[PDB]
Swiss-Prot record, chain B:
Segment of the intact protein contained: 20 to 329 of 366
Name of the protein in question: Monocyte differentiation antigen CD14
Annotated function: Coreceptor for bacterial lipopolysaccharide. In concert with LBP, binds to monomeric lipopolysaccharide and delivers it to the LY96/TLR4 complex, thereby mediating the innate immune response to bacterial lipopolysaccharide (LPS). Acts via MyD88, TIRAP and TRAF6, leading to NF-kappa-B activation, cytokine secretion and the inflammatory response.
Quaternary structure and interacting proteins, as annotated: Belongs to the lipopolysaccharide (LPS) receptor, a multi-protein complex containing at least CD14, LY96 and TLR4. Interacts with LPS-bound LPB. Interacts with LPAR1. Interacts with the TLR2:TLR6 or TLR2:TLR1 heterodimers; upon interaction with ligands such as diacylated lipopeptides and triacylated lipopeptides, respectively. Interacts with MYO18A. Interacts with FSTL1.
Tissue: Detected on peritoneal macrophages (at protein level). Cell surface expression detected in lung alveolar macrophages, dendritic macrophages and lung macrophages (at protein level).
UniProt free text on domains: The C-terminal leucine-rich repeat (LRR) region is required for responses to smooth LPS.
Mode of membrane association: Lipid-anchor; GPI-anchor
Gene Ontology biological process terms in this record: cellular response to diacyl bacterial lipopeptide; cellular response to lipopolysaccharide; cellular response to lipoteichoic acid; cellular response to triacyl bacterial lipopeptide; inflammatory response; innate immune response; positive regulation of endocytosis; positive regulation of interleukin-8 production
Gene (name only): Cd14
Disruption phenotype: No visible phenotype. Mice are fertile and appear healthy when kept in a clean, microbe-free environment. Mice do not respond to bacterial smooth lipopolysaccharide (LPS). Contrary to wild-type, they do not develop toxic shock or secrete TNF in response to LPS. Surprisingly, they have fewer live bacteria in their lungs and bloodstream after inoculation with bacteria and are not killed by an inoculum that is lethal to wild-type; they are killed when the inoculum is further increased.
Keywords, in A-Z order: Cell membrane, Disulfide bond, Glycoprotein, Golgi apparatus, GPI-anchor, Immunity, Inflammatory response, Innate immunity, Leucine-rich repeat, Lipoprotein, Membrane, Repeat, Secreted, Signal
Cellular component terms per the entry's GO annotation: external side of plasma membrane; extracellular space; Golgi apparatus; lipopolysaccharide receptor complex; membrane raft
Transmembrane feature ranges: none
Amino acid sequence: PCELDEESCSCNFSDPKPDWSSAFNCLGAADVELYGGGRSLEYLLKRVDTEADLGQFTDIIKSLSLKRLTVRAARIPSRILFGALRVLGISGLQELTLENLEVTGTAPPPLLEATGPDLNILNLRNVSWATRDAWLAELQQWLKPGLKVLSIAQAHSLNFSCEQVRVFPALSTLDLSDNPELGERGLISALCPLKFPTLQVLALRNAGMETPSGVCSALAAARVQLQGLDLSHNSLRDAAGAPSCDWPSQLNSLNLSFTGLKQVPKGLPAKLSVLDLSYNRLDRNPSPDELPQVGNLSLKGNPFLDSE
Amino acid sequence: ADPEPCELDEESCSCNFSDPKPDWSSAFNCLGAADVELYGGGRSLEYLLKRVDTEADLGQFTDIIKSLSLKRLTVRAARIPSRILFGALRVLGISGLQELTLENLEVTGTAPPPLLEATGPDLNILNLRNVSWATRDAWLAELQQWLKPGLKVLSIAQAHSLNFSCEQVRVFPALSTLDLSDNPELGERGLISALCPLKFPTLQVLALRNAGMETPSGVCSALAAARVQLQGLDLSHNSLRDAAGAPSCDWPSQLNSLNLSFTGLKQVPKGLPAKLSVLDLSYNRLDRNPSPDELPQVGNLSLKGNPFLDSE
Ligand SMILES: *[C@@H]1O[C@H](CO)[C@@H](O[C@@H]2O[C@H](CO)[C@@H](O)[C@H](O)[C@H]2NC(C)=O)[C@H](O)[C@H]1NC(C)=O
Ligand SMILES: *[C@@H]1O[C@H](CO)[C@@H](O[C@@H]2O[C@H](CO)[C@@H](O)[C@H](O)[C@H]2NC(C)=O)[C@H](O)[C@H]1NC(C)=O
Ligand SMILES: *[C@@H]1O[C@H](CO)[C@@H](O[C@@H]2O[C@H](CO)[C@@H](O)[C@H](O)[C@H]2NC(C)=O)[C@H](O)[C@H]1NC(C)=O
Ligand SMILES: *[C@@H]1O[C@H](CO)[C@@H](O[C@@H]2O[C@H](CO)[C@@H](O)[C@H](O)[C@H]2NC(C)=O)[C@H](O)[C@H]1NC(C)=O
Ligand SMILES: *[C@@H]1O[C@H](CO)[C@@H](O)[C@H](O)[C@H]1NC(C)=O
Ligand SMILES: *[C@@H]1O[C@H](CO)[C@@H](O)[C@H](O)[C@H]1NC(C)=O
């Protein structure tokens, strides 16, 4: 079922009733990967108690060497998900990665506050929830305040009910890459106002973005402040977009690589530390004023450079 | 009060043989170490000539030498007679030594040319820093007599002489990186005397940091005179001048990387290649962001650190 190959323990519970004892092998192992194989775990509701204070195990959990957890392909009910979260709370788990999960049913709000792994990194990819516009607000109810990196991919919904969303005090990186249906307007509905006081980096790769100015527009609407913005891998268009917009005053790094650009876009910030404009379709070398003052400029890959 | 000469780790064996003429015993401690450094404290090893037979076949140690885990060797601070240095080179030849670094040495006397050809370690890398030789312009030809044709990297720092007699110098079949950094007196004319015609067919990278260069075009000119071809040129840490230099010069056709960082440049110099993959112009003194034509077509441009960007 499981296997402690070096630091990893690819604990596999695809088969109906698994050999959980194996799990005790996935102990002392810093990296753990759980593959539910799409198997439903709604039968654990009748078997386990979510308010369980595993006396017998408390010390094990607190002594585990676990640091990076991945949980993929499984139809887990909300109750068991957060149950596990609460349990992990007393462990030293730093990074969590939920993937291809169908979290079902509603769970009651937790009693106390901040019950949860003191995570630095939380990654979600193709996770569906019982509710759909409040899943973020609810998951927050079990998260600690030190979260630094939040990655959300292929969400079925990001149009948050922002009044219920809370402040992410330490969140320095928000990665909404791979949400082809998000869009600039959709981006405004995701970046809840005043909820990312410390954001420094915002990644939006392959997220339906159309123009840098349009994105700047959304950033101003969201009253967001930040240092880096990655827009690589979007199909940016040759268009006016928003004719006027001030970029966040702290913006010093813009990525526009692999966005199929044919012209340098207008409305770029005036001064930048780095501007990655590589692997696009510029057929002419950028003119003087056409570009911002850049400390590090990349144009590698464009047609005008190839001399094949 | 028992510090043995060579202290071993698992890969790094460091030896100290500075004591007034003793303890050669340690060494067998190094056996099995990938890296080895031999410090001689500047002591003179000239006494080894009356004791060791430059030709003697180390039969008793031959296998040991053939079984050493030795890959990178550094030999520094010592006055070693030529005969001994090449004697050792010959010896290591049967070992799997890949990189050699000689530094702060005073190689003395002369040595007879080797009967055979290519009797030395099969090096990928050879480094010299502040090494002096008996002769002074033939030293490169002579050292060559003992080297294998597979050398990929030759680095020469603080040399007392780079004005080689090129007719004697032979081809470096595989040399791809030639590093002449730290030769402040070299200059652009002196560079021409170091780049022996046709001796570096496969050169790809030429590094010339802190080597008295003055203008990119003056360097280009030197390269043209040497009929040298290459892909990368590093001129960082030279005090490049605000001057015309050579008003006309075609760059080697394969050049795609020019480094002009930390050269105190105040203006974008003229005479740059038409197009480059990378142009590193950072940490200079540009007070104005470079104009259009002023720069070449560049894939990767760096201008970080210049004053025009500081907004302090
Ligand atoms: C996204 O995740 C969902 C999980 O809910 C995937 O769909 C499930 O896939 C498993 C197979 O592992 C099936 O047993 C479930 O019945 C599926 N449920 C649903 C929602 O239909 C879906 O395939 C994933 N998408 C991608 C691109 O991986
Ligand atoms: C700008 O965006 C590009 C494209 O996303 C970045 O290149 C990727 O970098 C990640 C990060 O390590 C790699 O995993 C990918 O393999 C890279 N993509 C490709 C196809 O090379 C690039 O690093 C960004 N540039 C800057 C200045 O950060
Ligand atoms: C360059 O290497 C030479 C060695 O050939 C150094 O000069 C010798 O230094 C030792 C000290 O360890 C003295 O005992 C010798 O008498 C010196 N010989 C000479 C040539 O006078 C010289 O110091 C080295 N330069 C640097 C910067 O280290
Ligand atoms: C251009 O040259 C500079 C300066 O020589 C390079 O920066 C140095 O790179 C070395 C070797 O990797 C580092 O160990 C030093 O710390 C760097 N020096 C300084 C002062 O920062 C730079 O990498 C070169 N540019 C390119 C494109 O390779
Ligand atoms: C976005 O959120 C608003 C506010 O709840 C809602 O009225 C609207 O239908 C949502 N639109 C989408 C695309 O989900
Ligand atoms: C190099 O050395 C030779 C012999 O000492 C000398 O005659 C010649 O002028 C030198 N060449 C240059 C260009 O310095």
